[PDB]
């Protein structure tokens with residue numbers, strides 16, 4: 001027992017669950033997706049982030065409602081979550097991993113260039129544009145995101161009264177974005193092999209110890225099917241030291257991403273999505 005706000009009902013007809021619901025914009029009769037966040041500062045920042053961003057591999061906000069709960073209107077993603085393509089040891093073919101990963105890299109590079117760190121990249125936050133395996137992907141869930149300081153201002157003065165831990169923190173400052181590159185490394189491992197790199201399944205070593213040591217579970221039988229280049233990129237993103245860890249630029253320059261065929265398929269999917277909204281141009 002509950003109702004939708006009158007302002008939402010005015011513009012949309014709510015439907016099935018995908019908290020995410022299928023809805024229809026009355027004006028166009030087009031399918032939309034409505035994210036319902038229960039009841040503030042994280043939602044306002046998320047909306048502000050979503051509105052400012054403009055990239056084909058990042059979800060766009062269509063509308064927003066601040067009522068009994070928060071209602072976020074987004075583009076519908078027919079393919080659903082990437083999670084559903086990797087769940088229960090299901091694995092994607094290398095070429096599919098590459099097409100998807102390239103887009104995730106472009107999306108995360110864009111975020112980083114724009115002073116945004118996602119902080120929660122997972123297969124459940126990566127959505128697919130269609131039920132076809134060759135599709136566009138979009139990064140979602142900016143609820144844990146951070147905007148890129150008090151350290152810089154502190155450094156301007158004389159450190160007469162400054163604590164040693166603050167001066168020691170100068171070595172590693174400005175490397176928070178590297179958390180996204182680690183997550184991408186974990187996502188890539190899962191896509192390639194169908195299993196997680198770090199887990200509490202059939203092991204004595206604790207999840208914390210596996211992650212800090214950077215000793216992922218390597219199953220040769222599973223990995224033999226995967227190329228040496230794809231595994232080399234995983235290895236370079238799964239680096240413990242955030243200062244040594246591969247950035248989005250380094251990952252995009254890696255030999256595994258140097259595939260003209262995959263890049264062509266991406267641009268082809270791009271023009272296909274844009275064709276419906278393309279306005280005549282000055283020749």
Ligand SMILES: Cc1ccc2ncnc(N)c2c1
Nearest residue numbers: 018020033074076077080140
């Ligand atoms: C965040 C968001 C946006 C669009 C979606 N479209 C389909 N299925 C989902 N689970 C979706 C989630």
